[PDB]
Amino acid sequence: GSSGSSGSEAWEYFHLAPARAGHHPNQYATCRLCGRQVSRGPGVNVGTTALWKHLKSMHREELEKSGHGQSGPSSG
């Protein structure tokens, strides 16, 4: 849920895989844009969802093209 920062829209370009193993689920994220895994880990939800970084890293054109201008109304 939205406890702290806001902007979990990047998730729309990623999907969490099942645990199907000893390690608890929600360990990695599968990019629905290209299909690359993007882990997060501790201390990640600090505004710019680790995902975003990947989206603007390669999908920079996708973000700009889409109706997504700025992702920080009260952040700099």
Binding-site residue ranges for Zn(2+): 31, 34, 54, 59
Indicate the residue among 26 and 36 with the shorter CB distance to Zn ion: 36
Site for Zn ion in 8-67 (CB under 5 A): 31, 33-34, 36
- Report the residue closest to Zn ion, judged by CB: 31
Are residues 14 and 38 in contact, defined by beta-carbon separation less than 8 angstroms?
A: yes
Give the Cα separation of 64 and 62 in Å (integer). Answer: 6
Interface residues with Zn ion (CB under 5 A) are: 31, 33-34, 36
